[PDB]
Amino acid sequence: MNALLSNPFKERLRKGEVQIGLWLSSTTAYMAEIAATSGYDWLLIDGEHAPNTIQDLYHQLQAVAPYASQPVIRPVEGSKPLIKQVLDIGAQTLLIPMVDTAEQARQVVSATRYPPYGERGVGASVARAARWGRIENYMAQVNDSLCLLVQVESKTALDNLDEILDVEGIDGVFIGPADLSASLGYPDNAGHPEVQRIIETSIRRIRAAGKAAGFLAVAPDMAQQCLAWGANFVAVGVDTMLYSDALDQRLAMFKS
Amino acid sequence: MNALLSNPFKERLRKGEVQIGLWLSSTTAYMAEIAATSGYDWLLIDGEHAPNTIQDLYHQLQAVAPYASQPVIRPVEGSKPLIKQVLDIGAQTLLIPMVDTAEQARQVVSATRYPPYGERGVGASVARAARWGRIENYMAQVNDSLCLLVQVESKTALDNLDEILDVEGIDGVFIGPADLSASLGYPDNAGHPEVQRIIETSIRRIRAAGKAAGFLAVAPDMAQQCLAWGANFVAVGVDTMLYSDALDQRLAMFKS
Amino acid sequence: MNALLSNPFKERLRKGEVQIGLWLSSTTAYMAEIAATSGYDWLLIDGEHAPNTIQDLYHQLQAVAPYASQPVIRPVEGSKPLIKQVLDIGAQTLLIPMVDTAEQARQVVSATRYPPYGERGVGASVARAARWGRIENYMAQVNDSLCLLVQVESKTALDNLDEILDVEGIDGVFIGPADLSASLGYPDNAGHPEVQRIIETSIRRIRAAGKAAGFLAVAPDMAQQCLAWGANFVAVGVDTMLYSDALDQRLAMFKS
Amino acid sequence: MNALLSNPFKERLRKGEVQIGLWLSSTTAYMAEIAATSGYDWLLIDGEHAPNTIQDLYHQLQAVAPYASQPVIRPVEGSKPLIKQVLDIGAQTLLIPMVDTAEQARQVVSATRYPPYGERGVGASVARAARWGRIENYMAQVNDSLCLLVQVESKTALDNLDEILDVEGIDGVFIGPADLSASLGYPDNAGHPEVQRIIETSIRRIRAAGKAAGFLAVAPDMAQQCLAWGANFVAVGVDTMLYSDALDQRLAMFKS
Amino acid sequence: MNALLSNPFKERLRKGEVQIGLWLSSTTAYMAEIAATSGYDWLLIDGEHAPNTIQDLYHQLQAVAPYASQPVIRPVEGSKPLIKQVLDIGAQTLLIPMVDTAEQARQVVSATRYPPYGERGVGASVARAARWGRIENYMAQVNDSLCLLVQVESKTALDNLDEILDVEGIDGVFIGPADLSASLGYPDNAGHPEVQRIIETSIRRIRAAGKAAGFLAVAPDMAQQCLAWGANFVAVGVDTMLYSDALDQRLAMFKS
Amino acid sequence: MNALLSNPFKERLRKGEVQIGLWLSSTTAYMAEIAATSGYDWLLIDGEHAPNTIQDLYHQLQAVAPYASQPVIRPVEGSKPLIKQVLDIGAQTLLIPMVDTAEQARQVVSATRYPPYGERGVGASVARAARWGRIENYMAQVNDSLCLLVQVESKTALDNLDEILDVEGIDGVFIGPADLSASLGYPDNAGHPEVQRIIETSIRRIRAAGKAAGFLAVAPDMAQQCLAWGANFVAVGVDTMLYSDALDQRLAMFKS
């Protein structure tokens, strides 16, 4: 098998290409494989808001692996041990929630790097990350292949946006509009004009730093708007929402 | 808890009511619960063409239990031991595949009834079927609350349709049009005009014999047609098909 | 399905009613369902001292859902991310261990409330908590249907009992007598007369502050005593203890 | 580790010792281990009337293995392939349901024996049965260590009792009173005097052949009676029944 | 994704190429993925002599999918329903045990082919076999990509070898030497020459009939000999045996 | 069953005996049981660098229980709640990663000891640790049977080694050479002599302080050297590495 690491999502991101994504919220490897057959550019395996254990995350990575869609993992928290677990199973692209300060962003980067650069403990050689040693010189290869995306979800995070963007090792900053809306005092109302203005300016600021700007837009009109504003890793739906809507729409043909 | 068995699907069937259903093809309890929130009249848990073990079937029954949509279980085949397993976990409505002769139909009914009338093995009192003894006088109550549906899939089954319809203990006869079309020498994609009258005639004969007539129509136009013919337990979609199509439709808004 | 949240356990607690409970310590959905057929008022799904993952907790909630007994979830600890996980799967009543100070109690309440009032991460609409969007206006409904119970386990917690009882958003305070006895320097087997007044006084103080008082009393004599003192969410057994004792009792009839 | 097979249940049976047993009906390895700590002589892992897959059976064998209680496995049916599966995982004592004729009993024995004596296919060398080769000369050792118990549950089976008892390789015959009662036309009424007379005579006949006589008696009075009549592998309860009764009895102290 | 089905194992088989394989006997997807990184030409997922459920088979297919090594599935037996299950999950190459007659071989082929020519149940369109509909015209493409291998492992089967080789749809014939030796009267009391002659002549006959010849040789010398004789799908070890031997050899460096 | 807790690993450790171990990195109970048949003195179930949930750890303990090899559990990190979980399931010997200071070491010890002397949460009586109450006086017996091993693996930790060795409750100190080499400034650009000197002096210091010294050496020559230096809990391979190497070596006999 190939002895080299590669991260296509990261390569595309670095070129500024637009990558269209889908949230995977069922925890199941069965649905992850089905979703992978659609050919989204990326699939966010949501370990934060769906009840995934580390084994469920593993199984969803195995399920999607032969397909073109690239997986991104979100752990329940960006702590050292939880980042350890997902890196060791070979997740190459992480979305880390609740990054509010540059110091927190530096600590997240440190958790992903072996000495001398970070504090990551060895073990990926006997794990999926190095394919049990088939990836040769993993320590030498690993940093360039890891893609780190952080969520800015608070008033505090936005205050520190430029400092966070200056943190070496951060590749992209993601805004989830419903989290930010709640933090700003507009819970469940991300369409509010005040929230929309903050989103628009923030995207331009992120791109100006030479970093990628990410978003989750469950409404297609909002997705198109964020793309126009310069977002380039954009999730355009949540799979369980698309499922329920599709089930409802089919049923409605026979009850109405 | 309630000490009585009930079977709302069976009660509605007996009244000749139309019941609209959805195939559950993922094996997962997670998706079964989500599907149950839609309010289909019935959900077909497909143990024949999806890789369900008996524990997956058990978990899907647990997931859907508090919701209004009624579960129907299809085992991998209608053998005595496989019917035993699904009856003991408390599946009260069965869809039995590949019933080709009246003798097979009689054997299926026998597999659902306790001795001395049938051949069902005794043991419900220590299983979910009798809720571990909370259902009082289970053996006296059970036949009235069990609903048995059989599939006609082949030329042979069509030849024997009248004789099958004369078998006591069968509540409904289901036609999967793709099954019958293949038997008649026509593949899956694009339904086939040549076999439509055979299908319509068969549906009308089932109803004329006083049994419920079932169908799976993944195309809404065909579902409306089979309903007009008199089919009254009609599955109008497969959840994994609705899922994939919805994912494709959402992605197409962002691609070319 | 019903678009409203409800929390019968919380409603009964608010009315001062006595609710009799059972600890579920096996991790298994199979046994949780069997236990639910007994008609305890509540079932404590023990995520702290039994080896439950978040998926085991999910499956136990699915198993008990159609029955009358109400589930209470205890996470491994009351951290922000672990509380997030159990809230998103739709656990509406939490028992939080090791609450030693009023500051800790405030942080626990904050972990259960959305910004800007709290720190709960947003995402219920794509999770079981809001039934994948079927619960309309979840964020408006949620606080009234969430019930928060905290454990006093230590000397420090006792010292801080009055201050904890003044924390808004706590509905009840639970005492595990074995926890407190150990903190006070007394082991598990045979309860200890020396600490009984401390326990009784504490129970009475909780009720006098207008909060519900909880207890686990595995000995029926002690359960009756704590009820007389005013405890009103009282667990009267641990299911694995009742199981082992019943197995032993049956075997003893045949041995010597 | 030890290179020799041993079957303590079989050794005790051959000496005519009375072995007291418990049915395990939850499918769970968690409860199987708890049950094993009681010290029943045997534990019947019920693959027939509880929804066990072959992996659940495996896990329950692993759970009980360090304890003194000896496991007995009942498969869903005594077919060649299902007997293959449970022998390969190292089940040394089988309870085979629905054995109605001597020919069926011979076929069951054949399914358990390698050539020249039976038709069992090789593979146990790379399976748990031979502990992955740590049991040396497995083929030479295996027959003496395998204990086969067959259920007589029909009028037909009782008719053929002496012929079944003459089948080489059958070590014991088990009567389940509720199955036999139903077959005789006394469903749910095994206490009926006619059923009791047949049970008593059958036990004596089994013992007269130098074979062990087995029974499941959920009522202690009936268990003591069958022991008096000469039954020597006697299951005295079902674990889920003892669980539910224990839960009910504890609750009743607080509702009455 | 690609709308054509391909079976690289079958393509190589048709080109007469030698394919070196490994048996996978642990049931685990974790180990299957590790094994796939070694670069065997094929991996036999043993559903007959290891305790695999259909879900374990599904997970092992998902695990190995992105790697070059091609999976071959052996079901518990070659029955209609069990073949149905494994074909629907997308196992394109099957090894069927215990094929003793040409009539049995024709029935196995029939179980793999759609009506009207066979008896395979319709439904792979909403399953992994057709990748949930991404494989267009699945019924038209399928026979060309399905590879059917049968085990001739008894004295009866060898007697019927020419008849079996002439069955349309049989792509290869496998000889498992331990079973054959046992059936020929040499269970493992070594009388080898008769068995070696039979293996050699059988392999040469299979090849002379233009079909692939298969073998499992855990001793490298025997594997080399069968290769020299013309076998072209040869499994050269069992993974759990290689694992135990490697663990033993490492420990021996430190012990006695 | 026996009412006394015993920890053979700790007994041998206290008697200064050399114990040869193997890392278990697959998460699977299937492979754990196979490994246990080899007769290593200890098996390290790696919950830190393999994706084990607490249930996977539980199942691996159940799998290895009847064998002589003693399990050692490494949790994801040595936090209070994570140590609580693994102690309650009956892991009597822990390996704790990333212990860098004496204060950290005292906190780890505290997490393992009951109030009033430590902070371990009460509840092991209804858990596997006390075998559901079969172990009498568990709180009195427990400290003598718990074995605590800590990893000193950073430049900080080695600086604090004498302080850590003096912490009451620490039974052994483990050195993982790859992590230490990285932290000392030699990630795997070979500068070895400094590292070899540090390993040797550290092992000798640990032993001179009357504590056990541990190491993981995947190269047999290095294992032999650490043994010669006085290490007395030495792991001599990682099972998934031995597996991959054995698979590669077998394939190489047939390929290039």
For chain E, the structural domain boundaries read 1-256
End-to-end CA distance of chain E: 56
Q: What share of chain E is helix, strand, coil (3-state, %, to 5)?
A: 45, 15, 40
Question: Contact at 8 Å (CB) between B211 and B171?
Answer: yes
* A182:C122 CB<8 A: yes
Angle C31-C71-C100 (CA atoms, 0-180°, nearest 5)? 115
Burial class of residue B167 (count of CB atoms within 10 Å of its CB; 0-12, 13-18, 19+): buried
Q: What share of chain A is helix, strand, coil (3-state, %, to 5)?
A: 45, 15, 40
CA atoms lying within 13 Å on the CB side of residue D87: 31
CA distances (Å), F223 to each of C223, D5, F176, F213, in order? 58, 35, 12, 13
Cis peptide before C75 (omega within 30 of 0): no
Question: Contact at 8 Å (CB) between E112 and E120?
Answer: yes
* D34:C240 CB<8 A: yes
For the annotated catalytic residues of E, the residue numbers are 49
D144's tokens: 């003496």
Give the Cα separation of D209 and F231 in Å (integer): 62
Give the Cα separation of F231 and F177 in Å (integer): 13
Q: Which of C247, C253, C256 to mutate to test the interface with D (most CBs of D within 10 A)?
A: C247
Give the Cα separation of F241 and E34 in Å (integer): 9
Owner of token pair 């080499």: F181
Q: Give the technique used to solve this structure.
A: X-ray
Nearest in space to B115 (alpha carbons), one of E141, D157, E46, A210:
D157
- Burial letters F38-48, b for 16+ CB under 10 A, else e: bbbbbbbbbbb
Cis peptide before B66 (omega within 30 of 0): no
Chain centroid, CA D193 distance in Å: 26
Give the Cα separation of A73 and A94 in Å (integer): 5
Count the neighbouring beta carbons within 10 Å of the beta carbon of residue E185.
13
Question: Contact at 8 Å (CB) between B119 and B80?
Answer: yes
- Burial letters F209-238, b for 16+ CB under 10 A, else e: eebbbbbbbbeeebbebbbebbbbbbbbbb
User: How close is the nearest chain C Cα to the Cα of F123, in Å?
Assistant: 6
For the annotated catalytic residues of C, the residue numbers are 49
Give the Cα separation of D198 and D194 in Å (integer): 7
Total residue length of chain F: 256
Q: Which residues of B touch C (CB under 8 A)?
A: 1, 29, 33-34, 37, 39, 59, 62-63, 65-68, 128, 131-132, 134
Question: Contact at 8 Å (CB) between F64 and F33?
Answer: yes
Amino acid type, D118: G
* C30:D27 CB<8 A: yes
DSSP conformational letter for F70: E
Count the neighbouring beta carbons within 10 Å of the beta carbon of residue F14.
12
End-to-end CA distance of chain F: 56
E230's tokens: 């013309």
User: How close is the nearest chain A Cα to the Cα of C227, in Å?
Assistant: 37
Give the Cα separation of E169 and E101 in Å (integer): 14
- Give the B:C interface size as CB pairs under 8 Å: 34
Resolution in A: 1.4
Classify C168 as helix, strand or coil.
coil
Give the Cα separation of B89 and D49 in Å (integer): 9
Task: Report strand pairing: E233-238 vs F212-216.
Answer: unpaired
DSSP conformational letter for C66: T
Owner of token pair 């690289």: E8
List the alpha helices (DSSP H) in chain A: 8-14, 29-36, 54-64, 80-88, 102-111, 138-145, 155-159, 161-165, 177-183, 193-208, 220-228, 239-252
Task: Report strand pairing: A212-216 vs B172-175.
Answer: unpaired
Nearest in space to D179 (alpha carbons), one of D97, D78, D72:
D97
Give the Cα separation of A241 and A247 in Å (integer): 10
φ/ψ of B237, rounded to 5, equals: 180, 165
Question: Contact at 8 Å (CB) between F30 and F245?
Answer: no
Chain centroid, CA D160 distance in Å: 20
Q: At what angle do helices D54-64 and D80-88 cross, to 10 degrees?
A: 30
Give the Cα separation of A42 and A36 in Å (integer): 9
Question: Contact at 8 Å (CB) between F175 and F203?
Answer: yes
Give the Cα separation of E230 and B114 in Å (integer): 56
* B55:D50 CB<8 A: no
Count the neighbouring beta carbons within 10 Å of the beta carbon of residue D188.
16
Nearest to D1 among F68, F128, F134 (CB): F68
Question: Contact at 8 Å (CB) between B119 and D179?
Answer: no
* B188:E54 CB<8 A: no
Q: Which residues contact C203 (CB under 8 A, 6 or more apart)?
A: C175, C213, C215, C226, C229, C230, C231
CATH (residue range D1-256): 3.20.20.60
Q: Which residues contact C199 (CB under 8 A, 6 or more apart)?
A: C175, C177, C180, C226
Give the Cα separation of B233 and B178 in Å (integer): 17
Nearest in space to A242 (alpha carbons), one of A40, A9, A18:
A40
User: How close is the nearest chain A Cα to the Cα of B189, in Å?
Assistant: 19
CA distances (Å), D147 to each of D44, D47, D90, D209, F36, in order? 13, 17, 12, 16, 26
Nearest in space to E5 (alpha carbons), one of E134, E114, E195, E174:
E134
Cis peptide before E116 (omega within 30 of 0): yes
C–A touching, 3+ CB–CB pairs within 8 Å: yes
Classify E112 as helix, strand or coil.
helix
Within 8 A of C51 by CB-CB distance, chain F residues are 54-55, 57-58, 85, 88-89
Nearest to B77 among E81, E88, E125 (CB): E81
Owner of token pair 């493992």: E188
Burial class of residue C50 (count of CB atoms within 10 Å of its CB; 0-12, 13-18, 19+): buried
DSSP chain B: ---S---HHHHHHHTT--EEEEEE-S--HHHHHHHHTT--SEEEEETTTS---HHHHHHHHHHHTTSSSEEEEE-SS--HHHHHHHHHTT--EEEE----SHHHHHHHHHHTS-TTTS-PPS-GGGSGGGGGGTSTTHHHHHHHH-EEEEEE-SHHHHHTHHHHHT-TT--EEEE-HHHHHHHTT--SSS--GGGHHHHHHHHHHHHHTT-EEEEE-SSHHHHHHHHHHT--EEEEEEHHHHHHHHHHHHHHTT--
Give the Cα separation of A87 and F49 in Å (integer): 10
List the alpha helices (DSSP H) in chain F: 8-14, 29-36, 54-64, 80-88, 102-112, 138-145, 155-159, 161-165, 177-183, 193-208, 220-229, 239-252
Question: Contact at 8 Å (CB) between F94 and F83?
Answer: yes
- Tally: H helices and E strands in chain E: 12, 8
Question: Contact at 8 Å (CB) between D28 and C240?
Answer: no
Torsion of CA B6, B9, B10, B11, to 10 degrees: 70
Give the Cα separation of E227 and E236 in Å (integer): 11
DSSP conformational letter for A78: -
Give the Cα separation of F169 and A21 in Å (integer): 51
Q: Which of B250, B255, B256 to mutate to test the interface with A (most CBs of A within 10 A)?
A: B250
DSSP conformational letter for F121: P
* B126:D241 CB<8 A: yes
Q: Which of B40, B62, B64, B138 to mutate to test the interface with C (most CBs of C within 10 A)?
A: B62
Nearest in space to F234 (alpha carbons), one of F13, F49, F81:
F13
Nearest to A65 among E39, E59, E66 (CB): E66
Count the neighbouring beta carbons within 10 Å of the beta carbon of residue D119.
17
Nearest to D89 among E46, E51, E176 (CB): E51
D–A touching, 3+ CB–CB pairs within 8 Å: no
Total residue length of chain D: 256
User: How close is the nearest chain B Cα to the Cα of E244, in Å?
Assistant: 30
Give the Cα separation of D103 and E17 in Å (integer): 47
Question: Contact at 8 Å (CB) between C37 and C67?
Answer: yes
| Residue in chain F lying closest to C187 (CA) | F139
Burial class of residue B221 (count of CB atoms within 10 Å of its CB; 0-12, 13-18, 19+): exposed
| Residue in chain A lying closest to B227 (CA) | A254
Residues paired with residue E71 on neighbouring β-strands, in sequence order: E43
Nearest in space to D233 (alpha carbons), one of D249, D214, D246:
D214
Q: Which residues contact A193 (CB under 8 A, 6 or more apart)?
A: none
Give the Cα separation of B229 and F84 in Å (integer): 64
